[PDB]
């Protein structure tokens, strides 16, 4: 008999107090607007898009969710953006200028001694 | 020390907080005594390990 | 208040269980402090060799030290961490040529 | 795995004896929770290290190297390489739930597409800034140079190295037509699901294993006490399983970490 | 009229101090954003706590009643406030069905058996409670349809009454020279306390999907993100049963018409054993004059399973019928057919006459009048020697103190109830060694599908 | 380790009892079989290069 968990799908209480939730599993016919159906299971209260961006929040086989479009809605993910090599058999690319980056790194070294 | 039911061990010094004129005893987070009120005097108590 | 409201011989029982309970607890917390040391240690590990590697000499390691290519590394001391401040190398403004 | 269905299964008197032992079920979610969010950022660090994704030019011809058998064929399940088909044709009980990885196989294959055409059009230089194209024959060489062998040695013998590394790639198939490395880490966690419900078939020193038998054939003082006994020896299983996990993530996490680097 | 509260009967669930603590606290409440009632008067039902607000500058509401009959021959609680202060009271009451110079207290006629005594624009709000035999009053007078905010309302009493309480009514003021009325529910709130100790905020943990997270996080500010609440479970709807056909059906049949029974001297003993017994058939007959069903209940038949049946079955008079039971005496009891003090069966006889009586009588049926020694539990005996009462031998023949110990009885139509014959059927159940024999029919049943069933 | 032979010590009662907990003897013979297979395996590719 049908069971699963429930989760929800928040933008943050400093942005709205809109809310989408998702049965783990459940097919959209044995739940009991906008339902959407994912790998993942039924997803309510967000509507769904065709085009593809960054993900945010994720949900699950490949499905995010963001707060963009406002109510809350969802779409696929993109891998990033696309880019062609010039590649030719006689042709190469060399830089003329550069630029000094930094950047951090951080890293645990210990926790609090209990007994 | 018992306190009309409260039974614990500790050390009993002059507290700083302001219970709520029907409160008898108050806890910290975790829910442990840390607060009594001294039912004759009627004063804040704090207990310490 | 088990004594309290109870003879010893049926209080010696219900005082073992609660022990036994209790004891289990201890268990679980050692257990898992014993886990979680490990994964802290191989993070010291990381850190001191990237001490070694990025702060007092120059890397080919690709990405040990950052992003592009190498050039030095400051430390900085955080509560419980390290922070590096990793300096690099990017190249810009490419044209192409034959 | 919930931990209320493992251990009582759909009944009321197991379900609110569960409430005098405290928050067991908040470690046990939090335990299990906490190791399977890290199984996704695992794979995210091994493939997505590439900002963009890298196409090869249709014209698939690099300076007589045939890349047919590692780059993606397009007429195939979905969009693997002839070699990864080999890679991967080679290879609601009770609770115990499995969750799907974030990312899909799809997913990941498009992330390997990417770094292959990054390094046969742009070699080393896309890792630290923009790809810079340079023709194949000009790459290999720079690698020579940088083992220690001068570059007219590949320039003169071109053909040799191609032919070369030609049929050394078409003796990959052979020897995959190997995996216990990943077959070893399905049959491990298989096994351990298994005997977590085979647990359930002890008494731990109870009259019956069936929560509806105990408590309705017996006397209700007593019902508890066994049916105590029968939470603890559950609740002991699910506790080991919970701790073989951890220290089953760690090692899952030390491999992918070198795989990472 | 209804209304919907907002954030409304909120009140301090104990004594314990408490500082800057998320605490979580299951009690009694008036949910949020509930349906309320509203009244401008008949009694109304209590059956958990009652919340209980108004608004008005003057003080038009006079006191309430309580209690279980809001009537007398009995105790109820009657509280009221003059301009002097509150009064509680529990007494016997004689209430007025419409209670309401300058002269006033009109409601009662009678304080009997008193058992407590106490003497001592605008929104004044109260939670009225009876837990364990206390009743208990929270409440709170703020100065300002009703408004929009939150506030905690604090304990006012404490009554050692004993008090129940199912019904209850209110007190006007009348005009001769507005309340509202919520209840109580099991819920569970997340409470938020500052730093002087109050209460300044809750959220209702059954409500709102979005609550149900801060709940579980012990926050009133979630972070974006998605988090993990609760779980969803279908639940079975009906109970399907599924037992096989029927088969046989243990011959009571022929046992209960069988064209003769025996004299009782020499009962019979028949020994079902291999069996699916249907008692329905004896229990809603019923033409019986006895049924004395003495080890189970006579309801309880099919549900048990025994290892054998034993059926006996024989003619007895109707003053007789009282000598079949365990512990008896008599000339039926001690020398024809005994119990034992340990009877687990059930006897049931019933009239015999117009199938045993004939015009002229029917000397068929005999019984023993002399024994030596009484009989034990489910003996029989079918000696035909002749008995001796004297100190003389007879050698087998009738005559002065040697008496045949057969004599017979001579049912005639035309006799009287008590002396026509009766047909006894004596059951008697055992459960030797043997793990599997008769035992009855389940009960109904049925079939469905394509749903969650249990 | 021989579960057996240190909860029971070669006892009939005891034994028979313990095969009511399941399966515990089992999992214990695999997870010191699974250390005890990669001690050789660690020494093997540290030398043998
Ligand atoms: C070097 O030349 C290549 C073409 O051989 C340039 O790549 C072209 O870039 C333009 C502008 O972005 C695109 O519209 C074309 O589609 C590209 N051609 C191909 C074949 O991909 C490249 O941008 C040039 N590099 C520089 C620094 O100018
Ligand atoms: C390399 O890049 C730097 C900028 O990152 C160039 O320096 C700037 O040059 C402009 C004039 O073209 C000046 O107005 C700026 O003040 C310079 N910036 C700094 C920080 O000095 C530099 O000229 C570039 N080199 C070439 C050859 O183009
Ligand atoms: C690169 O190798 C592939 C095989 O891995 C070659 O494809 C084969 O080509 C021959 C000749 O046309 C066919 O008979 C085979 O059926 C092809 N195999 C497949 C799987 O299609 C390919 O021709 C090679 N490329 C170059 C440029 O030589
Ligand atoms: C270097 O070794 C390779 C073999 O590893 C030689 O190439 C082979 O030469 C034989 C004899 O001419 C041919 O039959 C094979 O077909 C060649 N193999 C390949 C893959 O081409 C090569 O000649 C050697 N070089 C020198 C200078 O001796
Ligand atoms: C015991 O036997 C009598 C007769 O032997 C049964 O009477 C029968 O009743 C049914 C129901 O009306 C009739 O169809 C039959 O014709 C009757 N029998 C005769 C011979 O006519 C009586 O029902 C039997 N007892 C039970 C409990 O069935
Ligand atoms: C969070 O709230 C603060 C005000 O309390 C505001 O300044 C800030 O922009 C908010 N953050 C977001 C992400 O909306
Ligand atoms: C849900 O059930 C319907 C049939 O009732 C089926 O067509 C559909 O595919 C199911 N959905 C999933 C996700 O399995
Ligand atoms: C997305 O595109 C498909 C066709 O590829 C179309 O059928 C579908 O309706 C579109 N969805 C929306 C929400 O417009
Ligand atoms: C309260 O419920 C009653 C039915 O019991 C309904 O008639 C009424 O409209 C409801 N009130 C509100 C405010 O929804
Ligand atoms: C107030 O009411 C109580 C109860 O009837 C009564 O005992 C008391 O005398 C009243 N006070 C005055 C001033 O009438
Ligand atoms: C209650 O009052 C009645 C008279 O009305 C009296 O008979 C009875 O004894 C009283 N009960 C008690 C407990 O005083
Ligand atoms: C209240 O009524 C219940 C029955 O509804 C009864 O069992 C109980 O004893 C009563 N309580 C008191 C204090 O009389
Ligand atoms: C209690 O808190 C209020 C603010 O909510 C503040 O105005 C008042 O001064 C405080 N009093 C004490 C004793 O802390």
């Not at chain 5, 110990?405 to 059927?425: C, E, N």
Request: proline share 5%; aromatic share 12%; net charge neutral.
């Amino acid at each position: 008999c049908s069971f699963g968990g429930v989760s929800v799908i928040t933008p943050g209480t400093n942005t709205s107090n809109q809310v989408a939730v998702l049965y783990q599993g459940v097919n959209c016919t044995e739940v009991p607007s906008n339902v959407f159906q994912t790998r993942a299971g039924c997803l309510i209260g967000a509507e769904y898009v065709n085009n593809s961006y960054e993900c945010d929040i994720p949900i699950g086989a490949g499905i995010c969710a963001s707060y963009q479009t406002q109510s809350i809605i969802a779409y696929t993910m993109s891998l990033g953006a696309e880019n062609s090599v010039a590649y030719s058999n006689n042709s190469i690319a060399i830089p003329t200028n550069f630029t000094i980056s930094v950047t951090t790194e951080i890293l645990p070294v210990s926790m609090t001694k209990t007994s | 020390f018992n306190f009309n039911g409260l039974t614990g061990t500790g050390v009993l010094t002059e507290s700083n907080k302001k219970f709520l004129p029907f409160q008898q005893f108050g806890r910290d987070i975790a829910d442990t005594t840390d607060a009594v009120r001294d039912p004759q005097t009627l004063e804040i108590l704090d207990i310490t390990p | 208040d088990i004594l309290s409201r109870l003879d010893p011989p049926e209080a010696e029982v219900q005082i073992d269980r609660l022990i036994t309970g209790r004891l289990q607890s201890l268990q679980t917390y050692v257990t898992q402090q014993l886990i979680r040391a490990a994964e802290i240690r191989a993070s010291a590990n990381l850190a001191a060799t990237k001490m070694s590697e990025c702060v007092l000499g120059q890397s080919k390691r690709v990405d040990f030290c950052g992003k592009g290519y190498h050039l030095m590394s400051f430390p900085q001391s955080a509560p419980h961490g390290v922070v590096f401040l990793h300096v690099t190398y990017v190249p810009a403004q490419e044209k192409n040529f034959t | 795995v919930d931990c209320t269905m493992y251990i009582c299964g759909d009944s009321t008197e197991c379900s609110n004896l569960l409430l005098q032992y405290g928050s067991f079920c908040t470690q046990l979610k939090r335990a299990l929770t906490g190791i399977a969010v890290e199984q996704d950022k695992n794979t995210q660090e091994v493939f997505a290290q590439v900002k963009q994704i890298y196409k090869t030019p249709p014209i698939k011809y690099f300076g007589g190297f045939n890349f047919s058998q590692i780059l993606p064929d397009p007429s195939k399940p979905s969009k693997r390489s002839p070699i990864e088909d080999l890679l991967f044709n080679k290879v609601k009980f009770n609770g115990l739930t499995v969750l799907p990885p974030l990312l899909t196989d799809e997913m990941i294959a498009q992330y390997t597409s990417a770094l292959l055409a990054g390094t046969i059009t742009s070699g080393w230089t896309f890792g630290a800034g923009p790809a810079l194209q340079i023709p194949f024959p000009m790459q290999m060489a720079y690698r020579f140079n940088g083992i220690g062998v001068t570059q007219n040695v590949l320039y003169e013998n071109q053909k040799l190295i191609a032919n070369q590394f030609n049929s050394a790639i078409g003796k990959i198939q052979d020897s995959l037509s190997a995996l216990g490395k990943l077959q070893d880490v399905v049959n491990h966690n298989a096994q351990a699901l298994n005997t977590l419900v085979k647990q359930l078939s002890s008494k731990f020193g109870a009259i019956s294993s069936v929560l509806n038998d105990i408590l309705s054939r017996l006397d209700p003082p007593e019902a508890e006490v066994q049916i105590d006994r029968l939470i603890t020896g559950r609740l002991q299983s699910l506790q080991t399983y919970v701790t073989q996990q951890l220290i089953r993530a760690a090692e899952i996490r030390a491999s992918a970490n070198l795989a990472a680097t | 009229s209804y209304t919907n509260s907002f954030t409304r009967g909120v009140y301090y669930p104990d004594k314990v101090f408490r500082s800057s603590v998320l605490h979580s606290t299951q009690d009694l409440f008036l949910p949020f954003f509930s349906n309320v009632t509203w009244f401008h008067n008949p009694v109304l039902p209590f059956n958990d706590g009652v919340y209980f607000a108004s608004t008005e500058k003057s003080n038009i509401i006079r006191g309430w009643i309580f209690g279980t009959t809001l009537d007398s021959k009995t105790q109820s609680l009657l509280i009221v406030n003059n301009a002097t202060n509150v009064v509680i009271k529990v007494c016997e009451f004689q209430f007025c069905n419409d209670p309401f110079m300058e002269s006033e207290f009109r409601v009662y006629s009678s304080a009997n058996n008193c058992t407590f005594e106490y003497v001592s624009k605008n929104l004044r709000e109260f939670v009225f409670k009876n837990i364990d035999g206390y009743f208990k009053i929270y409440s709170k007078h703020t100065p300002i349809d009703l408004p929009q905010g939150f506030s905690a309302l604090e304990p006012l009493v404490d009554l050692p009454i004993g008090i129940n309480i199912t019904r209850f009514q209110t007190l006007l003021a009348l005009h001769r020279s507005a309340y509202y009325v919520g209840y109580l529910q099991p819920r569970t709130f997340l409470l938020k306390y500052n730093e002087n100790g109050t209460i300044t905020d809750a959220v209702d943990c059954a409500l709102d999907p979005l609550s149900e997270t801060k709940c579980t996080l012990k926050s009133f500010t979630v972070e974006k993100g998605i988090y993990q609440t609760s779980n969803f479970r279908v639940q079975p709807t009906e109970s399907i049963v599924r037992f096989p056909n029927i088969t046989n059906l243990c011959p009571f049949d022929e046992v209960f018409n069988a064209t003769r029974f025996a004299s009782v001297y020499a009962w019979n003993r028949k020994r079902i054993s291999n069996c699916v017994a249907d008692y329905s058939v004896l229990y809603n007959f019923a033409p019986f004059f006895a049924f004395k069903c003495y080890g189970v209940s006579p309801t309880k038949l099919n549900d048990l399973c025994f290892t054998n049946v034993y059926a006996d079955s024989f003619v007895i008079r109707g003053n007789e019928v009282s000598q079949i039971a365990p512990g008896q005496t008599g000339n039926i009891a001690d020398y024809n057919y005994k119990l034992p003090d340990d009877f687990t069966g059930c006897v049931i006889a019933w009239n015999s006459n117009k199938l045993d009586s004939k015009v002229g009588g029917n000397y068929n049926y005999r019984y023993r009048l002399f024994r030596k020694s009484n009989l034990k539990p489910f003996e029989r005996d079918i000696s035909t020697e002749i008995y001796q009462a004297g100190n003389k031998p007879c050698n087998g023949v009738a005559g002065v103190n040697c008496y045949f110990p057969l004599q017979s009885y001579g049912f005639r139509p035309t006799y009287g109830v008590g002396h026509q014959p009766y047909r006894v059927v004596v059951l008697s159940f055992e459960l030797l060694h043997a793990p599997a024999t008769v035992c009855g029919p389940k009960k109904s049943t049925n079939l469905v599908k394509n749903k969650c069933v249990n």
